[PDB]
Design a protein around this motif. Structure first.
Motif, mmCIF file in Angstrom:
data_model
loop_
_atom_site.group_PDB
_atom_site.id
_atom_site.type_symbol
_atom_site.label_atom_id
_atom_site.label_comp_id
_atom_site.label_asym_id
_atom_site.label_seq_id
_atom_site.Cartn_x
_atom_site.Cartn_y
_atom_site.Cartn_z
ATOM 1 N N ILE A 1 -6.818 51.293 67.523
ATOM 2 C CA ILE A 1 -5.411 51.506 67.174
ATOM 3 C C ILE A 1 -4.561 50.290 67.542
ATOM 4 O O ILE A 1 -4.599 49.823 68.681
ATOM 5 C CB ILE A 1 -4.869 52.774 67.823
ATOM 6 C CG1 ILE A 1 -5.749 53.962 67.429
ATOM 7 C CG2 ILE A 1 -3.401 52.985 67.431
ATOM 8 C CD1 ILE A 1 -5.364 55.261 68.085
ATOM 9 N N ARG A 2 -3.782 49.790 66.581
ATOM 10 C CA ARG A 2 -3.164 48.478 66.734
ATOM 11 C C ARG A 2 -1.882 48.534 67.566
ATOM 12 O O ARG A 2 -1.101 49.489 67.485
ATOM 13 C CB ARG A 2 -2.887 47.860 65.360
ATOM 14 C CG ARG A 2 -3.910 46.792 64.977
ATOM 15 C CD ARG A 2 -3.272 45.651 64.209
ATOM 16 N NE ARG A 2 -3.158 45.976 62.790
ATOM 17 C CZ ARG A 2 -2.575 45.193 61.882
ATOM 18 N NH1 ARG A 2 -2.038 44.023 62.233
ATOM 19 N NH2 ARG A 2 -2.519 45.589 60.613
ATOM 20 N N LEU A 3 -1.688 47.503 68.388
ATOM 21 C CA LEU A 3 -0.455 47.356 69.152
ATOM 22 C C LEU A 3 0.712 47.071 68.216
ATOM 23 O O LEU A 3 0.577 46.327 67.241
ATOM 24 C CB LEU A 3 -0.571 46.209 70.155
ATOM 25 C CG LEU A 3 -1.474 46.236 71.382
ATOM 26 C CD1 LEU A 3 -1.208 45.004 72.248
ATOM 27 C CD2 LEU A 3 -1.240 47.491 72.194
ATOM 28 N N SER A 4 1.872 47.646 68.526
ATOM 29 C CA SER A 4 3.098 47.227 67.855
ATOM 30 C C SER A 4 3.378 45.769 68.189
ATOM 31 O O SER A 4 3.322 45.369 69.357
ATOM 32 C CB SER A 4 4.269 48.106 68.282
ATOM 33 O OG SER A 4 5.383 47.886 67.442
ATOM 34 N N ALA A 5 3.638 44.962 67.162
ATOM 35 C CA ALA A 5 3.786 43.526 67.359
ATOM 36 C C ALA A 5 5.243 43.155 67.629
ATOM 37 O O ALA A 5 6.181 43.901 67.318
ATOM 38 C CB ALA A 5 3.277 42.749 66.142
ATOM 39 N N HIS B 70 2.692 48.288 59.190
ATOM 40 C CA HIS B 70 2.578 47.851 60.579
ATOM 41 C C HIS B 70 3.697 46.885 60.950
ATOM 42 O O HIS B 70 4.094 46.814 62.119
ATOM 43 C CB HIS B 70 1.216 47.187 60.845
ATOM 44 C CG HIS B 70 1.084 46.630 62.232
ATOM 45 N ND1 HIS B 70 1.293 45.296 62.523
ATOM 46 C CD2 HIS B 70 0.784 47.230 63.411
ATOM 47 C CE1 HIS B 70 1.122 45.100 63.820
ATOM 48 N NE2 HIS B 70 0.803 46.255 64.378
ATOM 49 N N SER B 74 6.869 47.365 63.743
ATOM 50 C CA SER B 74 6.944 46.315 64.744
ATOM 51 C C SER B 74 8.378 45.777 64.820
ATOM 52 O O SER B 74 9.273 46.245 64.123
ATOM 53 C CB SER B 74 5.930 45.220 64.425
ATOM 54 O OG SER B 74 4.651 45.731 64.718
ATOM 55 N N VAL B 135 3.155 49.897 73.402
ATOM 56 C CA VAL B 135 3.425 50.660 72.188
ATOM 57 C C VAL B 135 2.300 50.404 71.190
ATOM 58 O O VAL B 135 2.000 49.254 70.849
ATOM 59 C CB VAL B 135 4.790 50.298 71.586
ATOM 60 C CG1 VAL B 135 4.975 51.008 70.235
ATOM 61 C CG2 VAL B 135 5.908 50.665 72.541
ATOM 62 N N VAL B 136 1.678 51.478 70.719
ATOM 63 C CA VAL B 136 0.604 51.409 69.739
ATOM 64 C C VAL B 136 1.010 52.257 68.549
ATOM 65 O O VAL B 136 1.704 53.270 68.689
ATOM 66 C CB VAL B 136 -0.752 51.881 70.318
ATOM 67 C CG1 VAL B 136 -1.222 50.912 71.381
ATOM 68 C CG2 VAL B 136 -0.633 53.300 70.895
ATOM 69 N N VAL B 137 0.570 51.846 67.370
ATOM 70 C CA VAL B 137 1.068 52.490 66.165
ATOM 71 C C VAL B 137 -0.113 52.932 65.311
ATOM 72 O O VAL B 137 -0.639 52.145 64.511
ATOM 73 C CB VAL B 137 2.029 51.556 65.410
ATOM 74 C CG1 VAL B 137 3.411 51.627 66.036
ATOM 75 C CG2 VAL B 137 1.520 50.116 65.444
ATOM 76 N N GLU B 153 -10.053 50.811 62.159
ATOM 77 C CA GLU B 153 -8.898 51.310 62.891
ATOM 78 C C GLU B 153 -8.362 52.630 62.343
ATOM 79 O O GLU B 153 -7.456 53.205 62.954
ATOM 80 C CB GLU B 153 -7.789 50.251 62.913
ATOM 81 C CG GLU B 153 -8.152 49.028 63.757
ATOM 82 C CD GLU B 153 -8.175 49.324 65.255
ATOM 83 O OE1 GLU B 153 -9.278 49.479 65.834
ATOM 84 O OE2 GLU B 153 -7.087 49.387 65.856
#
Ligand SMILES: Nc1ncnc2c1ncn2[C@@H]1O[C@H](COP(=O)(O)OP(=O)(O)NP(=O)(O)O)[C@@H](O)[C@H]1O
Ligand SMILES: Nc1ncnc2c1ncn2[C@@H]1O[C@H](COP(=O)(O)OP(=O)(O)NP(=O)(O)O)[C@@H](O)[C@H]1O
Ligand SMILES: [Mg+2]
Ligand SMILES: [Mg+2]
Ligand SMILES: [Zn+2]
Ligand SMILES: [Zn+2]
Lengths: 431, 431
Positions: A1-5, B70, B74, B135-137, B153
């Protein structure tokens, strides 16, 4: 699960909530004041380094480990608690990022916590020049003996810092770490300040001991709208830490004691089962700066808000200042306003009626001593009581009447009052 | 070199710049309006899902690839450009994060761009319940044929979404993707709304077709301070996209045409080598809502700002509205105010003197037709011209005088004007 950038444009975005530049400065003063840092002095100055005009903030507080520094250069990390009656004003974990990036595009922080040393870069031009799509924060660590720990991330960090900061070399950079005098402290340098055409948004030349702005919301502007020295002097209701601005100490004051003809009242709002202290009196300096000073957790939120009869016309309540700390209201806009709630509106209404009763009462009291057509606004006044801060222990002391020209440094031992002539005696109650 | 981190507390922090809840709503309307999305309709509604009260925003615009989603979840990613005279109002890359998190603690977005489908979670309770320090999205992708791409993912993302969103199962979740009617579009669902004691900060029951607030800055409150329906109707100077609020279309208007006794003037500021259009006239609905409406890039920034003689007392300039678009000023506070600069102060001063000249001129013109002691404020008025938006092509059309009760849907073919009876004829000039 991807981090918010987090894109480097957001360093600019995040800074736009500061419209008045002094709210950015107050974010940095607040951080040195807060009880986890607990600095005794903060120094603010203008200097030139590598042909750039620079703002520096140096304090002698507790400093940071390399990790907490990375948290300070991140968004939303805040874990401040009260420590022996000293409540933190910070709580959102944003004040340094939004404040520093409002003053300039680039900032560097040097910190010593006694057992270590670190330096960190938060730099918009650096992120631009390397075409980064994420915000990265070069941090390099040092020990008591000036050797690099965590060399893994310290190598690339030092490469970035020496190339892309104001310090070309490693000992120029370690020279700043030594400008933090004692064992513990921190130093922030901001450059690429905001400019208009050529010169900076601030005025450093008009007064060598001040930072000035070349009037907001609106009467005449109070000095605190355009003089950092004036703003610092009222920023804290009961100041602890001292502020030295361009080498000259700011005469911070016990704001609740700076008035003449003081009456103490209380506010008993129905929406809240507490009573709230209020102080009314007359400004002594300039009868043109009046209204309510509103504080929250010892920090100034709103100054010179006119209430009661002072809104009807400029003939009534002139000179009357009120002082209240409203911990039940919600500061907004980087602690420069309150949320415009119903509780706010009722407080403003009650303040106005108490202001009216104080002013009419004072007109009556004046009429038993002075001529009837002489407006109370116009009698010359000095503070009912003069209080001074010890420069060694930072306690506040009440002086006997008549003492006007106090030295720039003052100590409990200078006290004419024999009961309060040593730094160990607890502060006297304000009553 | 370490990335700057983003703590989930910052989702709350970032939302506190919205004090008025409707500024959060306007951030979501703005995103559907902007030319990269270019939606024709946005639907706002209250629904209950899984026993939670929910806000939904559905538009039939271009949608998003899994990657741009995404970026939307962000901070600071914004690359909007003008497209055929349609200039974006967004530019900071923050409106969705700060807006959505002001309305509720948790949001989910479903999007189709024609060639794909994606859904994303931005959820404060999810990040709390897993004790995340970043924070993960969670984002999961689908194709034209409802099969998961980027399964890498998408597995952990789908696990998080089904457990920690309002949809227990996969086809309940794909049921929302079908609530986006056509091939392209997007749908946002916000829940865990802000509450006071028990119930929500909004009032959904007082009017089944509106969202209401149970007065700001201050006179009587204009409807747009507390009625979302009233606010939407003036949000855009020249509206394109249509707004359907709880199933009933909002009567958006050509604001520059909604006045009586219109005079067109221009402002020639010296600090700028352009001329600026201004329109003055009288409000037709409620003589108590007057002052200047100030727009920026077709979006409303400040409404009913009193200027000139309207500041001196409530006897002068009553009913007088002015409309100006000030692209030379700087919007602040989530596009609810302007930076209080010198250019702002000069514009306000010039607006006031033009307002004064219009009002005195109108009193004189009125005195040649009506009785002298009859105030112009009080003559009953209807708009000089009535303009209606075609519901098929969204062009604005001028109707002949006298037409009051228009259907809820209207089309160029209904036009009595034979020159403008087909959707291909370009819009008539406003003059
Ligand atoms: N001069 C300093 N010395 C030591 N630590 C500091 C200093 N300034 C900031 N910090 C630390 O950096 C962290 C983040 O600072 P900041 O961004 O101002 O957020 P905050 O003070 O916690 N809350 P807020 O100011 O309301 O956003 C603080 O929590 C401190 O722990
Ligand atoms: N309904 C939507 N449909 C398709 N794309 C959207 C939608 N809403 C937002 N986006 C995209 O998400 C990105 C971020 O949105 P947002 O956080 O509002 O920043 P922004 O609109 O670019 N600038 P700003 O609103 O001033 O902060 C936008 O740039 C859009 O590309
Ligand atoms: Mg802080
Ligand atoms: Mg936006
Ligand atoms: Zn002492
Ligand atoms: Zn049409």
């Amino acid at each position: 699960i991807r981090l918010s950038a987090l894109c480097p444009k957001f360093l600019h975005t995040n800074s736009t909530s500061h419209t008045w530049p002094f709210s950015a400065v107050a974010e940095l003063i607040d951080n040195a004041y807060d009880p986890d840092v607990n600095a005794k002095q903060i120094w603010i100055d203008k200097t030139v380094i590598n042909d750039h005009i620079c703002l520096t903030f140096t304090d002698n507080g507790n400093g940071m480990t390399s990790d907490k520094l990375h948290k300070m250069l991140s968004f939303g990390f805040s874990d401040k608690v009260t420590m022996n009656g000293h409540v933190p004003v910070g709580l959102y974990g944003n004040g340094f990022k939004s404040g520093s990036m409002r003053l300039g595009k680039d900032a560097i922080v040097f910190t010593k916590n006694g057992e270590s040393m670190s330096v960190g870069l938060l730099s918009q031009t650096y992120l631009e020049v390397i075409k980064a799509e994420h915000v990265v924060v070069p941090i390099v660590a040092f020990n008591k003996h000036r050797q690099m720990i965590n060399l893994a991330e310290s190598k690339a960090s030092l490469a970035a810092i020496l190339e892309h900061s104001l310090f070309s070399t490693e000992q120029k950079l370690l020279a700043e770490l030594d400008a933090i005098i004692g064992k513990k402290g921190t130093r922030i340098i901001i450059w690429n300040l905001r400019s208009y055409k050529n010169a900076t948004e601030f005025d450093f030349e008009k007064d060598k001991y001040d930072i000035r702005i070349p009037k907001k919301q609106e009467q005449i502007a109070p000095e605190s709208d355009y003089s950092l020295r004036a703003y610092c002097s009222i920023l804290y209701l009961k100041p602890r830490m001292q502020i030295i601005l361009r080498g000259q100490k700011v005469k911070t004051q016990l704001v609740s004691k700076s008035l003449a003809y003081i009456e103490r009242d209380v506010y008993r709002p129905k929406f809240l089962s507490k009573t709230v202290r209020i102080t009314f009196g007359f400004n002594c300096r300039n009868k043109d700066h009046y209204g309510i000073m509103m504080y929250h957790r010892n920090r100034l939120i709103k100054a010179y808000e006119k209430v009661g009869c002072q809104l009807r016309a400029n003939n009534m309540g002139v000179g009357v200042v009120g002082i209240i700390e409203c911990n039940f209201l919600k500061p907004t806009h980087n602690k420069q306003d309150f949320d415009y709630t119903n509780e706010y509106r009722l407080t403003i209404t009650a303040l106005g009626e108490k202001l009216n009763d104080y002013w009419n009462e004072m007109k009556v009291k004046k009429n038993t001593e002075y001529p009837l057509n002489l407006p109370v606004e116009d009698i010359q006044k000095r503070p009912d009581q003069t209080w001074v801060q010890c420069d060694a222990c930072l306690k506040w002391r009440k002086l006997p009447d008549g003492m006007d020209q106090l030295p720039e440094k003052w100590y409990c031992s200078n006290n004419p009052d024999p009961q309060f002539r040593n730094c160990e005696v607890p502060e006297e109650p304000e009553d």
